[PDB]
CSV table of C-alpha atoms and ligand atoms in Angstrom, one decimal:
chain,number,residue,atom,x,y,z
A,126,UNK,CA,-11.9,30.8,-11.3
A,127,UNK,CA,-12.5,27.0,-11.3
A,128,UNK,CA,-12.3,25.2,-14.6
A,129,UNK,CA,-15.4,23.9,-16.2
A,130,UNK,CA,-15.2,20.5,-17.7
A,131,UNK,CA,-17.5,17.4,-18.2
A,132,UNK,CA,-16.3,15.6,-15.2
A,133,UNK,CA,-15.8,15.7,-11.4
A,134,UNK,CA,-12.8,17.4,-9.8
A,135,UNK,CA,-10.4,14.6,-8.8
A,136,UNK,CA,-7.7,14.4,-6.2
A,137,UNK,CA,-5.4,11.5,-5.5
A,138,UNK,CA,-3.7,10.9,-2.1
A,139,UNK,CA,-1.1,8.3,-1.3
A,140,UNK,CA,0.2,7.2,2.2
A,141,UNK,CA,2.4,4.6,3.8
A,142,UNK,CA,0.0,4.1,6.6
A,143,UNK,CA,-2.9,1.5,6.5
A,144,UNK,CA,-6.3,2.5,5.1
A,145,UNK,CA,-8.9,0.4,6.8
A,146,UNK,CA,-12.1,2.4,6.3
A,147,UNK,CA,-13.7,5.6,5.1
A,148,UNK,CA,-12.6,7.6,8.1
A,149,UNK,CA,-8.9,6.7,7.4
A,150,UNK,CA,-9.1,7.9,3.8
A,151,UNK,CA,-11.0,11.2,4.7
A,152,UNK,CA,-8.3,11.9,7.4
A,153,UNK,CA,-5.6,11.3,4.7
A,154,UNK,CA,-7.4,13.9,2.4
A,155,UNK,CA,-7.7,16.3,5.4
A,156,UNK,CA,-4.0,15.9,6.3
A,157,UNK,CA,-2.3,17.4,3.2
A,158,UNK,CA,-2.6,18.8,-0.3
A,159,UNK,CA,-3.4,16.2,-3.0
A,160,UNK,CA,-0.6,14.2,-4.4
A,161,UNK,CA,-2.1,14.8,-7.8
A,162,UNK,CA,-5.2,16.3,-9.4
A,163,UNK,CA,-7.2,15.2,-12.4
A,164,UNK,CA,-10.4,15.4,-14.3
A,165,UNK,CA,-12.7,12.4,-13.6
A,166,UNK,CA,-14.7,12.3,-16.8
A,167,UNK,CA,-15.2,8.5,-17.1
A,168,UNK,CA,-15.6,6.9,-13.7
A,169,UNK,CA,-14.8,3.3,-14.4
A,170,UNK,CA,-11.3,2.6,-13.2
A,171,UNK,CA,-9.2,-0.5,-13.0
A,172,UNK,CA,-9.0,-3.4,-12.5
A,173,UNK,CA,-5.3,-3.9,-11.8
A,174,UNK,CA,-2.9,-5.5,-9.4
A,175,UNK,CA,0.2,-4.8,-7.2
A,176,UNK,CA,-1.0,-1.7,-5.3
A,177,UNK,CA,-2.7,1.3,-6.9
A,178,UNK,CA,-0.1,3.7,-5.2
A,179,UNK,CA,2.9,1.9,-6.7
A,180,UNK,CA,4.7,2.8,-10.0
A,181,UNK,CA,2.3,3.7,-12.9
A,182,UNK,CA,-0.6,1.7,-11.5
A,183,UNK,CA,-2.6,4.9,-10.8
A,184,UNK,CA,-2.2,5.9,-14.5
A,185,UNK,CA,-3.4,2.5,-15.6
A,186,UNK,CA,-6.4,2.6,-13.1
A,187,UNK,CA,-7.5,6.0,-14.2
A,188,UNK,CA,-7.1,5.1,-17.9
A,189,UNK,CA,-8.9,7.7,-20.1
A,190,UNK,CA,-8.7,10.3,-17.3
A,191,UNK,CA,-4.9,9.8,-16.6
A,192,UNK,CA,-3.9,12.3,-19.3
A,193,UNK,CA,-5.3,15.1,-17.0
A,194,UNK,CA,-3.0,14.3,-14.0
A,195,UNK,CA,-1.2,17.2,-12.6
A,196,UNK,CA,1.9,15.1,-11.8
A,197,UNK,CA,3.1,11.5,-11.5
A,198,UNK,CA,2.9,10.7,-7.8
A,199,UNK,CA,5.8,8.8,-6.3
A,200,UNK,CA,5.3,5.3,-4.6
A,201,UNK,CA,3.2,4.8,-1.6
A,202,UNK,CA,1.8,1.6,-0.1
A,203,UNK,CA,-1.9,2.7,0.1
A,204,UNK,CA,-3.9,5.4,-1.8
A,205,UNK,CA,-7.2,6.6,-2.9
A,206,UNK,CA,-9.3,9.3,-4.7
A,207,UNK,CA,-11.7,12.1,-3.7
A,208,UNK,CA,-13.9,13.3,-6.5
A,209,UNK,CA,-16.4,16.2,-6.2
A,210,UNK,CA,-18.7,18.1,-8.5
A,211,UNK,CA,-22.1,17.8,-10.1
A,212,UNK,CA,-24.2,15.1,-12.0
A,213,UNK,CA,-27.2,16.0,-14.1
A,214,UNK,CA,-30.2,13.9,-13.0
A,215,UNK,CA,-33.9,14.3,-13.5
A,216,UNK,CA,-36.2,14.1,-10.5
A,217,UNK,CA,-37.0,10.4,-9.7
A,218,UNK,CA,-35.6,7.2,-8.1
A,219,UNK,CA,-32.2,5.8,-8.7
A,220,UNK,CA,-29.7,3.3,-7.3
A,221,UNK,CA,-26.1,2.6,-7.5
A,222,UNK,CA,-24.4,-0.7,-8.2
A,223,UNK,CA,-20.7,-0.5,-7.5
A,224,UNK,CA,-17.8,-2.9,-8.2
A,225,UNK,CA,-14.9,-2.1,-6.0
A,226,UNK,CA,-11.7,-3.1,-4.2
A,227,UNK,CA,-11.3,-1.7,-1.6
A,228,UNK,CA,-14.1,0.4,-0.1
A,229,UNK,CA,-15.9,3.7,-1.0
A,230,UNK,CA,-18.6,6.2,-0.2
A,231,UNK,CA,-20.7,8.1,-2.6
A,232,UNK,CA,-22.8,11.1,-1.5
A,233,UNK,CA,-25.5,13.0,-3.3
A,234,UNK,CA,-26.8,16.4,-2.1
A,235,UNK,CA,-25.2,15.7,1.2
A,236,UNK,CA,-26.6,12.3,1.8
A,237,UNK,CA,-24.6,8.9,1.4
A,238,UNK,CA,-26.1,6.8,-1.3
A,239,UNK,CA,-23.5,4.0,-1.6
A,240,UNK,CA,-21.1,2.9,1.3
A,241,UNK,CA,-18.6,0.2,1.9
A,242,UNK,CA,-16.8,1.1,5.1
A,243,UNK,CA,-14.1,-1.6,5.0
A,244,UNK,CA,-11.5,-3.3,2.8
A,245,UNK,CA,-12.5,-6.1,0.5
A,246,UNK,CA,-11.4,-8.1,-2.6
A,247,UNK,CA,-13.4,-7.2,-5.7
A,248,UNK,CA,-17.1,-7.3,-5.0
A,249,UNK,CA,-20.3,-5.8,-6.6
A,250,UNK,CA,-22.9,-4.3,-4.3
A,251,UNK,CA,-26.4,-3.3,-5.4
A,252,UNK,CA,-27.2,-0.3,-3.2
A,253,UNK,CA,-30.6,0.9,-1.9
A,254,UNK,CA,-32.6,3.4,-3.9
A,255,UNK,CA,-32.7,7.1,-3.3
A,256,UNK,CA,-34.8,9.9,-4.7
A,257,UNK,CA,-33.9,13.2,-6.5
A,258,UNK,CA,-36.5,15.8,-5.8
A,259,UNK,CA,-35.7,18.5,-8.4
A,260,UNK,CA,-34.3,17.9,-11.9
A,261,UNK,CA,-30.9,19.4,-12.7
A,262,UNK,CA,-27.3,19.2,-11.6
A,263,UNK,CA,-27.1,17.5,-8.2
A,264,UNK,CA,-24.0,17.8,-6.0
A,265,UNK,CA,-22.0,14.6,-5.8
A,266,UNK,CA,-18.8,13.5,-4.1
A,267,UNK,CA,-17.1,10.1,-4.0
A,268,UNK,CA,-14.1,8.5,-2.1
A,269,UNK,CA,-12.5,5.2,-2.9
A,270,UNK,CA,-9.3,3.7,-1.7
A,271,UNK,CA,-6.9,0.8,-2.0
A,272,UNK,CA,-5.2,-0.7,1.0
A,273,UNK,CA,-2.9,-2.7,-1.2
A,274,UNK,CA,-3.2,-5.5,-3.7
A,275,UNK,CA,-5.8,-5.4,-6.4
A,276,UNK,CA,-7.9,-2.2,-7.2
A,277,UNK,CA,-11.0,-1.5,-9.1
A,278,UNK,CA,-13.8,1.2,-8.9
A,279,UNK,CA,-16.8,1.2,-11.1
A,280,UNK,CA,-19.9,3.0,-9.6
A,281,UNK,CA,-22.9,2.5,-12.1
A,282,UNK,CA,-26.3,4.0,-11.7
A,283,UNK,CA,-29.8,2.9,-12.6
A,284,UNK,CA,-32.7,5.2,-13.3
A,285,UNK,CA,-35.1,2.3,-14.2
A,286,UNK,CA,-35.4,0.2,-11.1
A,287,UNK,CA,-32.2,-1.8,-11.7
A,288,UNK,CA,-32.9,-3.0,-15.2
A,289,UNK,CA,-30.1,-1.0,-16.9
A,290,UNK,CA,-27.1,0.8,-15.4
A,291,UNK,CA,-24.8,3.5,-16.7
A,292,UNK,CA,-21.3,4.8,-16.0
A,293,UNK,CA,-21.0,8.4,-14.8
A,294,UNK,CA,-19.1,10.1,-17.5
A,295,UNK,CA,-18.9,13.3,-19.6
A,296,UNK,CA,-22.5,12.9,-20.8
A,297,UNK,CA,-23.9,14.1,-17.4
A,298,UNK,CA,-20.9,15.3,-15.2
A,299,UNK,CA,-20.1,18.9,-14.5
A,300,UNK,CA,-17.1,20.3,-12.5
A,301,UNK,CA,-19.0,23.4,-11.4
A,302,UNK,CA,-22.6,22.9,-12.1
A,303,UNK,CA,-22.7,25.0,-15.3
A,304,UNK,CA,-23.4,23.1,-18.5
A,305,UNK,CA,-20.1,21.9,-20.3
A,306,UNK,CA,-19.7,22.3,-24.0
A,307,UNK,CA,-16.3,20.5,-24.2
B,654,LIG,C1,-4.9,-8.5,-3.7
B,654,LIG,O1,-6.2,-9.0,-3.2
B,654,LIG,C2,-7.1,-8.4,-2.4
B,654,LIG,C3,-6.8,-7.0,-2.0
B,654,LIG,O2,-6.9,-6.2,-3.2
B,654,LIG,C4,-7.8,-6.4,-1.0
B,654,LIG,O3,-7.5,-5.2,-0.7
B,654,LIG,O4,-7.8,-7.2,0.2
B,654,LIG,C5,-8.0,-8.6,0.0
B,654,LIG,C6,-7.8,-9.4,1.2
B,654,LIG,O5,-6.5,-9.2,1.8
B,654,LIG,C7,-7.1,-9.2,-1.1
B,654,LIG,O6,-7.4,-10.5,-1.4
B,655,LIG,CA1,-6.3,17.9,1.4
B,656,LIG,CA1,3.9,6.9,-9.9
B,657,LIG,CA1,-9.9,1.8,-18.2
B,658,LIG,CA1,-1.9,-1.1,3.3
B,659,LIG,CA1,-6.9,-3.7,-2.6
């Protein structure tokens, strides 16, 4: 039985190897069990300095979500998160606008909808639009990492052609696709 909460299932992975791109972080995820798990209920993390994977920087980055950490990871030089679950979206057109250091990839129903496949200091990208064909809980996953230095991750979403954007949070997230009443 998987817990039902208004958020995505979060895993944190640290490493002392360099993370240069999405493939490197995905390989880290594949290589071992998560260094910590958490509930990602308010996906607006950071900004901070001096390496996400050091000290209590992960706690600071995750903020409101850090109280669900399964453990306090030890130090690493590099690290990132893998989030997976569901997001309620009505049928229609949407686009992400993501602020991040370093890179990331967001997929919905198996299709990438926001990608930065490299390291970068803090930068905001307005991504291309995508469509949702059927209203309901859509499958979503995210990866984000920090190679070192500063770190931030805020993937906002627009339903109105880029006029307004919202953070993905407990209003619309579900860990299993069932309706949360939490
Ligand atoms: C600490 O500053 C940032 C770092 O966070 C980013 O990963 O890579 C950038 C270039 O090294 C740095 O300027
Ligand atoms: Ca794993
Ligand atoms: Ca720590
Ligand atoms: Ca915060
Ligand atoms: Ca590094
Ligand atoms: Ca960084």
